[model samples]
Target: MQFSKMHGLGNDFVVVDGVTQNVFFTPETIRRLANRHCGIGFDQLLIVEAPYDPELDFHYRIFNADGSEVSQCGNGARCFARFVTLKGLTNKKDISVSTQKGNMVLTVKDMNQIRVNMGEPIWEPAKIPFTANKFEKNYILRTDIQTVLCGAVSMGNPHCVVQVDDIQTANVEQLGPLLESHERFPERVNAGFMQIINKEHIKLRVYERGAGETQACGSGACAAVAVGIMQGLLNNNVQVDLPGGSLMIEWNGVGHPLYMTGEATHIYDGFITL
Candidate 1:
């Protein structure tokens, strides 16, 4: 199989060109490729395919290293956008792509900058699939060790956000998995810890479902800012600093689509065998 290595702020992915090549990937294949010591080693594997519809330019699939299919991946979307253009699939800088969750528009700003229109955020607990009967910005999750308040939101996928004094000290390794597998989120959710720097700035770390903690989580950034604005903790426009790098997130309000702009880079090209 032919593939390329790519990253968005260090959130790495092994991109397979399904549009031009005959590709077959199994859950076992994904697990092997995801192994850092044994295979390609990527947080997620992105499959770029021909658009299922004429309205879209491409069809993108997201696979966690564990071999599970996911609904949406923001960083992957950006990379997919660039990958198509880089591979001569499309010449237009602005292209629409389809994902399991919904459609998103990607615009190439320059060499490294790419912007994505991550469709509107969802609030209904039933839609987010959280077991809660009602919606509230704050909900309590009590464990034998502690009680925590968290906000649930969806950016094509589920996410739970917790505020911490400092992300540097946040118990992501402990609470991330706890909340991710928490019973409230029936579909499972990404666990995000945020340290508010101000109305316009924040530091974030996201423990992505299936993928664990990534240097950057584009959708997670959007979800954090979306929920932050929902709770009046952040401004409409915010800068999110992640371990990999940073992204600028803009959200007008609840009903508005979140705009995420950041880097999409090509690392190299190589081939793999089945």
Candidate 2:
């Protein structure tokens, strides 16, 4: 099968056009592709197929390294937009694509900069699928190690954001997994460690569920920013600096769709046998 390797920041993906090429994937095959030692390494695999809904331009799907399907991936969405245009699948600069979560509008500002309208952030505990009696900006969670004060939000997928004093020293390798598998989050969540630099800047790292720690996580960034905004720790326009690179996130409060602006890189194109 023909595939293109791509990344937004450093959250890389193996993108395939299922619309024009006949391709098939299984958990086993995905695991093989995700194996760094012997296969094409990537945080997630993105597939583009014909849209079932006539209103949409394409249907996008995301699979983690472990092969579990996920609802949304913000960085992958931008790469998807670029992929479609580069592959000549679509001619329009603005494309509407449907994922497991919902429709997202991707606008290609240029080859290097892509803007995505990541749907409204979901904060209701029940909707975030976080086991809580009511909605609160910050929730106190006790783990086996210690108690944690964190915020929960869903940008199409579940996320738990913990504020830390220092991004470089945060116990991400240790605390990320514990919070991700914590009982309160019924659905496993992406655990984010964020260090606020100011109202307009922050640094982040994410232990993504099913994928472990990655170079960058677009959805995790959105979740972190949403939580920060609600907590009044951040402004509407924030620059999120991850280990790989940075993303500009803008949210006009609760009712508006969040806009994420960033770059997507194409590594190479090759044919991989299944």
Candidate 3:
């Protein structure tokens, strides 16, 4: 199959153009493709196809290395916008794309930059699918070592954000798996460890539900910033720095939509026989 490799910050994906190629991939194939040592390594595989929504211009499907279909990918969307535009799929500067989550709007700011309207943040318990006693803006989840105050929100998928004193010192590798598989989150969740550098700046590391730890996570950043603003710890606009790079996230606390601004770069293109 012919494929394009891309990344937002350091979170990488193998992007396939379903419009011109037919990929009948299985779980085993996906696992092999994402193997860093033996195959084309990536956090997820993004399949670009024809839009099912009549109003949108394209469609995208996300699959983790384990071959499970996922609802949304924030960094992947920016790569999708860049891929379609460079391939001459569409000429409109602003475009709508469909994913398992729903319709998402994307705008190409320049050759490398893209801004995505990630839609409204859902805070309701049922919507976030957390099996807690009740839902609030921020909930306390207990672990063996510490009690974390987590804000649960859905940016198409479930995310749990915990504000910490230091991002560098946070035990993401130790706590990430536990929280990702925590019983409270019925659908499993991406766990974000965030530290507020200031009112306008923050740092985060994410353990994605299906992809494990990555360089950066787009949806995770949005969810973290949204929760920060909702809890009055941050302002509407903030710069979120990840291990790979940084992304700008903005959300007014009044239920307005969130915006993610970042860059997507093409790594290389090649054919791999599965």
Candidate 4:
């Protein structure tokens, strides 16, 4: 199968165009393809298919390395935009695509830059589907390192945001797995560790649910900034620094859609024989 290797920030994905190719995708195949040690390494497998809904331009499906189908992935969307455009699927500068979560709008800015509209964040516990009795600014979630306050938000997927004093000492390996499977988040959740540099800048590390620590997480950054805005800890427009690089996140704080601007680079392209 022909595949394009791409990344947003540091979160990487193997993007495949299903519109022209006829390849069967199974859970086991996805798991094997996502295995770093045994197979084609990737955090997620992004499949671009012909749009099922006539109103949209394309359809996107995301699969985690564990072979689980996920609703959405922010970083993947940016890469998706670049993939389709480079592959000649669409020449439109701006395109709308459908995902399992909802509709996503993307725009190609430059050779490596892409912008995405992630839509509005959902705070309702039922929509976010958090097990908490009530929604609060921050919730205390226990991890191996220490008890930390995680600001929770749902941007098509559940995310737990935590702020740390130092990015270097955040203990991602020690605490990421614990928080990802914590009882409070029954469906599993992405864990974000953030260090605030100022009102306009911050650094982030994410333990993506089902994927471990990745180079970058687009939705995690959006949810983190949205929750931070609710807590009065961050401004609407902010720069989120990830291990791979930085993403510009903007939310109006009034349930408006979140905008993420970042780079999507094509590492290489090749075919894997199965």
Best by TM-score: 2
Q: Please provide, for model 1 over 131-167, each residue's C-alpha lDDT reduced to its tens digit, 9 standing for 90 to 100.
A: 8868998878765557899898887789889999999
Residue 126, candidate 2: how far off, in angstroms?
Answer: 1.6
Q: TM-score, each model? A: 0.87, 0.88, 0.87, 0.84
Candidate 2 weakest ten by summed lDDT: 68-77
Q: What are the Cα lDDT values of the candidates?
A: 0.85, 0.88, 0.86, 0.84
Better of 1 and 4 by TM-score: 1
How accurate locally is residue 168 in candidate 2, as Cα lDDT from 0 to 100?
93
- Which of 3 and 4 is ahead in lDDT? 3
- Model 3 poorest ten-residue lDDT run: 67-76
RMSD of 4: 3.1
- Candidate 4's C-alpha lDDT? 0.84
List where candidate 1 sits over 4 angstroms from the true fold. 27-43, 65-72, 271-274
Candidate 4 residue 66 Cα shift, in angstroms, is: 5.8
Candidate 4's C-alpha runs over 4 A off are 27-44, 63-72, 110-112, 141-146, 267-274
